[PDB]
């Protein structure tokens, strides 16, 4: 089965006996669910995203059913804006990125060429938009706020910027700001024909 990225890759999961909607997120190392009760022991942990760090409860060896596939692993619970299924569980259910095939054992980092520079960037199905580290691109831009795990950051929005990714040409909106990692979001993933497969 194949999941395209023109919309957010949302799926129903079953966890602790309950159904929930969650986002299949190649940009997350970990699985993070909104405030809920889970049985058993847990430990306090901190995780980070765009916007900064948040406190979560780490529950280990939790069973989670996703797209009819059973995973058993770490589930973090905390003030995430969206329920997220990260690579820790995507790998268990055999999910890969395809356009060539990219497994999710490691962060899916690839070289992109943009505004005449080469940079490493994260292929991120949990990102609507493409966000790059600070760079002085020419052209008109307009300010924008984008949200992630820890809150919002201010970015500059540039339109119709050519980006080559894995040898595929793309052209579209690139946001530039103080992101901790360069992110390729669905706006450009769809253009290079990337899908999620299992």
């Amino acid at each position: 089965p194949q999941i395209t990225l023109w919309k957010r890759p949302l799926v129903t999961i079953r966890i602790g006996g309950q159904l929930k909607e969650a986002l299949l997120n190649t940009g997350a190392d970990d699985t993070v669910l909104e405030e809920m009760n889970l049985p058993g022991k847990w430990k306090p942990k901190m995780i980070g995203g765009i916007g900064g760090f948040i406190k979560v409860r780490q529950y280990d060896q939790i069973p989670v059913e996703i797209l009819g596939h059973k995973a058993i692993g770490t589930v973090l619970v905390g003030p995430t804006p969206v329920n997220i299924i990260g690579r820790n569980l995507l790998t268990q259910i055999g999910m890969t990125l395809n356009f060539p095939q990219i497994t999710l054992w490691k962060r899916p980092l690839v070289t992109i060429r943009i505004g005449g520079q080469l940079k490493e960037a994260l292929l991120n199905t949990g990102a609507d938009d493409t966000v790059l580290e600070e760079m002085n691109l020419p052209g008109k831009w307009k300010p924008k706020m984008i949200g992630g795990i820890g809150g919002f950051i201010k970015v500059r929005q540039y339109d119709q910027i050519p980006v080559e990714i894995l040898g595929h040409k793309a052209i579209g909106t690139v946001l530039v700001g103080p992101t901790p990692v360069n992110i390729i979001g669905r706006n450009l993933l769809t253009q290079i024909g990337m899908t999620l497969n299992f």
């Binding site: 986002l23 997120n25 940009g27 997350a28 190392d29 970990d30 993070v32 942990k45 901190m46 995780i47 980070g48 995203g49 765009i50 995430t80 804006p81 969206v82 997220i84 990260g86 994260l122 991120n124 949990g126 990102a127 609507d128 938009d129 966000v131 924008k144 706020m145 984008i146 949200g147 992630g148 795990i149 919002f152 946001l175 992101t179 901790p180 990692v181 992110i183 979001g185």
Partner: peptide, 9 residues
Amino acid sequence: KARVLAEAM
């Protein structure tokens, strides 16, 4: 608003 949900521990 746009969500960009990169995450790491």
